[PDB]
Symmetry: C2
Subunit: 115 residues, 2 copies
Amino acid sequence: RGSHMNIKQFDILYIDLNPTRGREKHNVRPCLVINNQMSIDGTNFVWVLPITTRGLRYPTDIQLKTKKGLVSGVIDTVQIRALDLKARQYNYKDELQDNLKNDILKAIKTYLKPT
Amino acid sequence: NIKQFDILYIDLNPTRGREKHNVRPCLVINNQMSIDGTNFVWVLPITTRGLRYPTDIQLKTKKGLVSGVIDTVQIRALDLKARQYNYKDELQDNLKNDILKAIKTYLKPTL
């Protein structure tokens, strides 16, 4: 069909998270981009949720499903992080299936609404 | 212990490129259920370099003890069991909603 051309919201990309501290996710790993196109284009930061190889373990975990089936695992919706794409090497690989997009965004907003 | 909209000194190192580094005030933005449930804190870093970007929001606090600009682009979940942090101040009440709305705007698709 065509070249992807630029990172878009809900792309899955490999990126080095290192270095980090404590329970913060580490290493080169797939991550799910969740900020919108204007923000990515306007800042060259991506907001990511890191993907892990463990199964579901916590209520905040969401099973990953993708359009190409090239990345599998669980999305850790707690560990949101903005990364500078100008400074960290990355590789686009896959995209989140459409029917999961709103669940991701609704999970994130539940963590912001004052308790 | 930590509350949503608390402002904490936190060491953010190590970072890369434009990612805010060093020890600096940070605004806590996840809710109490998230903080107490996961022991992660979501923060927006605060800077003294001024207001440069349309994503910047000038800081106002309850005690007047912290000043600067909130960088709303650079959201970060941090493990505060593995980092140095201390409470310093709190966001002004009438800024709380604008902050949350500013974060939720990054999530709304622009297709």
